[PDB]
C-alpha cells in the first residue's frame, strides 16, 4: 500500500498539473508543453513566492491585480487560482 501510494502521487504529478488540473496530453500538443506549463505557467513554487511577495509588500503599493488577490486571500476565497482553464486554453485560437 505504501509503494502504491508513492506510485499514485508520482503518476498524478506526471499526468495532471497541480493547480489547474489539466491533463498532460493537452499541454503536450505543443512539444515540451507539460513541463513548460508546470515550470513556468503554473509553478506551485511560483505561487508560494507570489504569496510571500504580497505578504511582504505594503498594502498601499499594491497594484490592481495585487489588491484583488490580497482581498480574496484575506477573505480566504480561492478563485484566483485557475481551475480547468489556463492562458493556453483561453487564447487557443488567438495565440496559436
Amino acid at each position: 500500500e505504501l509503494r502504491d501510494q508513492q506510485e499514485q502521487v508520482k503518476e498524478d504529478m506526471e499526468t495532471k498539473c497541480f493547480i489547474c488540473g489539466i491533463g498532460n496530453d493537452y499541454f503536450d500538443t505543443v512539444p515540451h508543453g507539460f513541463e513548460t506549463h508546470t515550470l513556468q505557467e503554473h509553478n506551485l513554487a511560483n505561487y508560494l513566492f507570489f504569496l510571500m511577495y504580497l505578504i511582504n509588500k505594503d498594502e498601499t503599493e499594491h497594484t490592481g491585480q495585487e489588491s484583488y488577490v490580497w482581498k480574496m486571500y484575506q477573505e480566504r476565497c480561492w478563485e484566483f487560482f485557475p481551475a480547468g482553464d489556463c492562458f493556453r486554453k483561453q487564447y487557443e485560437d488567438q495565440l496559436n
Partner: protein, 184 residues
Amino acid sequence: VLLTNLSEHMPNDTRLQTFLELAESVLNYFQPFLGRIEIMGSAKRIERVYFEISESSRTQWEKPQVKESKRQFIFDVVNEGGEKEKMELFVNFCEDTIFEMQLAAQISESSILTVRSALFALRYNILTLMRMLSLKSLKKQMKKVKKMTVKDMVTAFFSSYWSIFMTLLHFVASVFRGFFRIIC
C-alpha cells in the same frame, strides 16, 4: 517585466523579438528573479502576473528540508487530501513554508586520501609496465622473432596479456598496502 509581458502577450511580433535580441543580457540576469503565475482576474479572464522573487527566498526554498516538506505535503494532498479542500491545504502549506523560510533567513545572518592513494598506485604500477617497453631491448628480442614462428607470435601475445594481468595484481596489492598504511 515589461519586455516579458509584451513578449508573452504577443507570440509573434518580429520587432519585439528584435528588442529581445537587443536585451538577452538583462533578461538572462533577471531570469532567476522574475516570477510568473496565472490567476483568474476580475474580468472572468486568466491573466499572468509578474512579480519579484528574491535571492534569499530562492535559496531558502532550495534548501533540502523545504523540499522534503514539499514532498510530504504533495504526498498528503494527493493521497488523503480531497479535491474540494486541496487549494486550502495548499495555502496553509504556503503560509507555513513562508514562515519557516523567513525564520531560517533571519537566523542565517552574518576520501581524498583514498583517491590520492589510488592515483599513486595506478601511476606507479603502469609506469613499471611502461619501463619494460621503454627498454629498447625489443631489437635484442628480435633474435627469436627474426626466425619467424607462429609459436613465437602466440607466446608473445599471451605473455603480453599475462604481464598486463601481473600488473593488475601488483596494482591491487599496492592499493591494499596503501590502504593499511593510510588508515594507520
